[PDB]
Amino acid sequence: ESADLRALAKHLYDSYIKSFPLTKAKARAILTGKTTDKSPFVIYDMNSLMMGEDKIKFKHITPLQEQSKEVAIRIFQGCQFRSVEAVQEITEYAKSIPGFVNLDLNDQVTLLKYGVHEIIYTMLASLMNKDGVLISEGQGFMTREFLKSLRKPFGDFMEPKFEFAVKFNALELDDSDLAIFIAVIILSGDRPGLLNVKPIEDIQDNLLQALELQLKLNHPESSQLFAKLLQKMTDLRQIVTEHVQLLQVIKKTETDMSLHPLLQEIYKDL
Amino acid sequence: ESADLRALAKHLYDSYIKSFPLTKAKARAILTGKTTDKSPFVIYDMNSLMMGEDKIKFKHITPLQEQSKEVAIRIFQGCQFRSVEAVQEITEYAKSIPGFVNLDLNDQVTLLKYGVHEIIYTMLASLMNKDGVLISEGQGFMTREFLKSLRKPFGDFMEPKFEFAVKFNALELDDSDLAIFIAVIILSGDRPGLLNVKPIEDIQDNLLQALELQLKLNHPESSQLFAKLLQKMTDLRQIVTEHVQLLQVIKKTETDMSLHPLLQEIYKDL
Ligand SMILES: O=C(O)[C@H](Cc1ccccc1)Oc1ccc(CCc2ccccc2)cc1
């Protein structure tokens, strides 16, 4: 019954809101949008980052650039720290999807382990436009130029994601849409190692049917949007693969450090 | 609302099952012969230790050890592998603790630094009974007596732990109890160096509430179990202290032995 689906959509959207601080709606306002009442700190130059890191509420290290701890590394690493905060936010959202917590615990871990990078880049698009990405809960903004002028390995790191974001955002989906989409992603069924695929695809079939109605009733003039969104799952996958790549290329720049034992432990890969 | 607390417990118990391969429940089932689906091989001497490499999965030496890392040394270098292994896990259990990742990076490291061994000795009791302790995921069982008859120094490492366990297991706590206690231990606040404290103590306060409800519901007839358990935290501190000084003696009577990096970094003095 359509009523059942409309119901599931509201539940998912409700949890999403509770589970994620910065929403796309909220992020869109700060961005190009006006809603000027608390403008962000633009970081466009080396001095911009320096002369504005002792004022930002970012957790990692104080601004110090003088032949000690490079900016390129402090930025990449700072990106991991946040990515890990996000994972707890996603794990909590997964537990809100009907049927999820009832599945074999091992499969739950398997589903979260492989679905997390896909969710992260999906939501990273909500905070990006063609000129840059919002930073620190939206308190600041880091231009796309500065990022492209970083170290050799780190210069081509966030460019493929800027490209994905631009095309992805062309779809003009809103938080209520993203909520269901993100759930479809988690309830895949082709993840390696699953022990009992049946219930997983059963739940996903239900989420897919909800997504179809959510898009048809929320974007009436946007024909076949359902199909267009599912096709994006191809780009995301490439984005995730291509990412583990450069990542390994970095795993050969900085490693053996007797000061990062318990810290590097908390930041494996995902 | 006692509803949210119950929900927090459920959460924690769930991540607990997901981070530890050998739960107390599996352990007791193995320790009580009632279930011979897979009984352990017993180690109470050199012969049985020799026959040990056989069925059990050991990559160490099997034959003589007098001229190739004596037995005592053989036992403890493996023990060392288990600790780093436990830390990596506890480290993983931590990230799932609501709020732990949102804290100051420096403090996170401080929290894991002082809590890790206290947790290991808490969980290590799930594998001991008056007579000994399970080894290699439960496939083996090493005699308390054998362990105590080890060379002058090494033979003092485990005894104090057995004493803690005998009394601690008296409490008859189950896996869903240990999960919350384990969390209350990490989020201390009275730990040295903590840049902050209020954020840290807000989370523990919440954990303590959940543990308090769990014990009541789960152990209705056990008077003052909450308080009794917290008093146990005192016994852990001492144990960590006798352990450290012992560790220091080995560092001097064996210039050949080397304490793993991830363990040397955690350890300190005074
Ligand atoms: O302090 C630790 O992190 C571990 C904690 C522990 C102890 C017992 C069971 C599980 C975990 O206990 C020890 C004690 C001694 C050692 C010595 C390691 C060693 C032995 C022989 C040769 C070289 C190094 C390592 C770990």
Curated annotation (Swiss-Prot), chains A, B:
- Where is this chain primarily localised? nucleus
The UniProt record lists the NR LBD domain at 4-269
UniProt key word Nucleus: yes
Entry's induction text: (Microbial infection) Expression increases when incubated with M.tuberculosis or its lipoprotein LpqH; induction is TLR2-dependent (at protein level).
| Effect ascribed to mutating residue 18 to R | More than 50% loss of ubiquitination
The entry marks the following residues as binding rosiglitazone, namely 80-83, 117, 243, 267
Q: Signal peptide location in the record?
A: none
Tagged with keyword Transferase: no
Q: Where is this motif: 9aaTAD?
A: 261-269
Keywords carried by this UniProt record: Activator, Biological rhythms, Cytoplasm, Diabetes mellitus, Disease variant, DNA-binding, Glycoprotein, Isopeptide bond, Metal-binding, Nucleus, Obesity, Phosphoprotein, Receptor, Transcription, Transcription regulation, Ubl conjugation, Zinc, Zinc-finger
| BP GO annotations | BMP signaling pathway; cell differentiation; cell fate commitment; cell maturation; cellular response to hypoxia; cellular response to insulin stimulus; cellular response to low-density lipoprotein particle stimulus; epithelial cell differentiation
Q: How is it modified after translation?
A: Phosphorylated in basal conditions and dephosphorylated when treated with the ligand. May be dephosphorylated by PPP5C. Ubiquitinated by E3 ubiquitin-protein ligase complex containing FBXO9; leading to proteasomal degradation. Ubiquitinated at Lys-18 by TRIM55 leading to proteasomal degradation. Ubiquitinated by E3 ubiquitin-protein ligase STUB1/CHIP; leading to proteasomal degradation.
Write out the coiled-coil annotation as residue ranges: none
Question: What does the tissue specificity note say?
Answer: Highest expression in adipose tissue. Lower in skeletal muscle, spleen, heart and liver. Also detectable in placenta, lung and ovary.
Subcellular location(s): the record lists: Nucleus; Cytoplasm
Effect recorded for residue 80 to P: In colon cancer; sporadic; somatic mutation; loss of ligand-binding
Example of a GO cellular component annotation carried by this entry: nucleus
How is this chain's activity regulated? PDPK1 activates its transcriptional activity independently of its kinase activity.
Q: Which GO terms describe its molecular function?
A: alpha-actinin binding; arachidonate binding; chromatin binding; DNA binding; DNA binding domain binding; DNA-binding transcription activator activity, RNA polymerase II-specific; DNA-binding transcription factor activity; DNA-binding transcription factor activity, RNA polymerase II-specific
Subunit notes for this chain? Interacts with FOXO1 (acetylated form). Heterodimer with other nuclear receptors, such as RXRA. The heterodimer with the retinoic acid receptor RXRA is called adipocyte-specific transcription factor ARF6. Interacts with NCOA6 coactivator, leading to a strong increase in transcription of target genes. Interacts with coactivator PPARBP, leading to a mild increase in transcription of target genes. Interacts with NOCA7 in a ligand-inducible manner. Interacts with NCOA1 and NCOA2 LXXLL motifs. Interacts with ASXL1, ASXL2, DNTTIP2, FAM120B, MAP2K1/MEK1, NR0B2, PDPK1, PRDM16, PRMT2 and TGFB1I1.
Family membership: Belongs to the nuclear hormone receptor family. NR1 subfamily.
Recorded domain comment = The 9aaTAD motif is a transactivation domain present in a large number of yeast and animal transcription factors.
Disorder association: Defects in PPARG can lead to type 2 insulin-resistant diabetes and hyptertension. PPARG mutations may be associated with colon cancer. Obesity: A condition characterized by an increase of body weight beyond the limitation of skeletal and physical requirements, as the result of excessive accumulation of body fat.
**Summary of the function given for this chain in its UniProt record:** Nuclear receptor that binds peroxisome proliferators such as hypolipidemic drugs and fatty acids. Once activated by a ligand, the nuclear receptor binds to DNA specific PPAR response elements (PPRE) and modulates the transcription of its target genes, such as acyl-CoA oxidase. It therefore controls the peroxisomal beta-oxidation pathway of fatty acids. Key regulator of adipocyte differentiation and glucose homeostasis. ARF6 acts as a key regulator of the tissue-specific adipocyte P2 (aP2) enhancer. (Microbial infection) Upon treatment with M.tuberculosis or its lipoprotein LpqH, phosphorylation of MAPK p38 and IL-6 production are modulated, probably via this protein.
Q: What is this protein called?
A: Peroxisome proliferator-activated receptor gamma
Q: Report the source organism.
A: Homo sapiens (Human)
| Gene that encodes it | PPARG
Shown part of the complete sequence: 235 to 504 of 505
